[PDB]
Design a protein around this ligand. Structure first.
Ligand code: HEM
Ligand code: NI
Ligand code: NI
Ligand code: NI
Length: 460
């Protein structure tokens, strides 16, 4: 039964904190998991947490009756940006359940059919950008994927056009958002956050948020200027009421949800698409098989909703990309009551767990020894995979609400990418994963050759 938990090097009162003195901390928690195993203790000033890495222990952690969602120190900081929005609010603090009930219809499958036409509107824009490049020019993949995913959630969700393909540098929203999220991640290393040395950081942050909120002001303003009726994510936000309480969303809260969905609805998807395209050019026979399916299925000028759902292997490319590098690399849980995990490590009420998603997906006692290798064929049969062995979208009633939204978009775009282009690893890119809480490959550049297949029109 019971045994004690391994713990990495400690540095006096700082405990394990100096170990995360890196701009790549998740990949460093991976270095440690490989050392100490399926579980280890991480202490910092005024916080302890247990990092899980095995399917064995994580299967237990996803028992909603034993464990509830925890706000990690990261999310506690992000809360300064997103407030008590869907992602950063407690399960029992329910402006959550209130918003959950109000918004969940916007991700009903009848709603997905509504978004598709708008998803193609942006997807066409991406393809046309690349089909209009000159032969000497490179494609900045994560940059352009971000343009695609921001504009999609912007249109589908709020009927607002960021028009990112009409812009040189990133949208002012993106610059503020990235910098503000970098602050939340970087603040995890400050032993004294309120030292006046970080006054410049506190000042930049309040201005970054000023910028993000003045965009939200635009979205709501343009909305009350009417556009006949709408039933997108923003409409249900303004007019929907929680059946349990008969109450609509607080004014302070509708703003937090817009911020939430603008951020949460695109950073991990562009990350996914950038990781997917990366793996394809590093495994050309996988790229071929995927491109062949793309050509075989997408026969009309623009993809139909049904056609996207027929791209099974393109879906497998995505899931495998999410396996090797889940772009939301971790989520937290707390013990509802006293209990014992894996019958070996006893936990007190309110103790904190971290599910290290990249290490879960490298569990050799689930996936084989060929963990690091990119084989989409693992997902050829969903029925096979044990539950809680694959968790890129979290768990339970607080798993990703936008999961179907992300995968439908990603498959659609990746579909059109393979139908319309060949891809050359122009720089022989060495994978350099950048962390802003989320994961994305930085500096990734490809070259595209057009297959010269015309495009049609757009429904929306
Ligand atoms: C590949 C893309 C995505 C990944 C990997 C991902 C991952 C996740 C994860 C792990 C969680 C749980 C967080 C936690 O347990 O602390 C989550 C929740 C959430 N996601 Fe996603 N997500 C993706 C795309 C999206 C999209 C497209 C949307 C669009 C709206 C979205 C909106 C949300 C929201 C609102 C929550 C919180 C829901 C709740 O807990 O009530 N995500 N996501
Ligand atoms: Ni025993
Ligand atoms: Ni070149
Ligand atoms: Ni061959």
């Amino acid at each position: 039964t019971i045994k004690e938990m391994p713990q990495p090097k400690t540095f006096g009162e700082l405990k394990n904190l100096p170990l995360l003195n890196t701009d790549k901390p998740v990949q460093a928690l991976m270095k440690i998991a490989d050392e100490l195993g399926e579980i280890f203790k991480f202490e910092a000033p005024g916080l302890v947490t247990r990092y899980l890495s095995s399917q064995r222990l994580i299967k237990e952690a996803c028992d909603e009756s034993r464990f509830d969602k925890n706000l990690s120190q990261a999310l506690k900081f992000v809360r300064d940006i997103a407030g008590d929005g869907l992602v950063t609010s407690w399960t029992h603090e329910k402006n959550w359940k209130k918003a959950h009930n109000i918004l969940l219809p916007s991700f009903s499958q009848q709603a997905m059919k509504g978004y598709h036409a708008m998803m193609v509107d942006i997807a066409v824009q991406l393809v046309q950008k690349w089909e209009r490049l000159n032969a000497d020019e490179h494609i900045e993949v994560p940059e352009d994927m971000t343009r695609l995913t921001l504009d999609t959630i912007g249109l589908c969700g709020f009927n607002y056009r960021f028009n990112s393909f009409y812009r040189d540098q990133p949208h002012p929203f993106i610059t503020s958002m990235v910098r503000a999220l970098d602050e939340a991640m970087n603040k995890q290393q400050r032993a004294n956050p309120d030292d006046p040395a970080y006054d410049e950081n506190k000042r930049q942050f309040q201005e970054d948020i000023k910028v993000m909120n003045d965009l939200v002001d635009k979205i709501i303003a343009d909305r009350k200027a009417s556009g006949e009726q709408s039933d997108d994510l923003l409409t249900h936000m303004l007019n929907g009421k929680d059946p349990e309480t008969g109450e609509p969303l607080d004014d302070e809260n509708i703003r937090y949800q817009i911020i939430t969905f603008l951020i949460a609805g695109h950073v991990t998807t562009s990350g996914l698409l950038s990781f997917a395209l990366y793996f394809l050019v590093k495994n050309p026979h996988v790229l071929q098989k995927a491109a062949e399916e793309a050509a075989r299925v997408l026969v009309d000028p623009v993809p139909s909703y049904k056609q996207v759902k027929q791209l099974k292997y393109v879906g497998m490319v995505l899931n495998e990309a999410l396996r090797l590098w889940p772009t939301a690399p971790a989520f937290s849980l707390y013990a509802k009551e006293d209990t014992v995990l894996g019958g070996e490590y006893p936990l007190e009420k309110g103790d904190e767990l971290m599910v290290l998603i990249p290490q879960l997906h490298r569990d050799k006692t689930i996936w084989g020894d060929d963990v690091e290798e990119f084989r989409p064929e693992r997902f050829e049969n969903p029925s096979a995979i044990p539950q809680h062995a694959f968790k890129p979208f979290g768990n339970g009633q607080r798993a990703c609400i936008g999961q179907q939204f992300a995968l439908h978009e990603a498959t659609l775009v990746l579909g059109m990418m393979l139908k319309h282009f060949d891809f050359e690893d122009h720089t022989n890119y060495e994978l350099d994963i950048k962390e802003t809480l989320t994961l994305k490959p930085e500096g990734f550049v490809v070259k595209a050759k057009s297959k010269k297949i015309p495009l049609g029109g757009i429904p929306s």
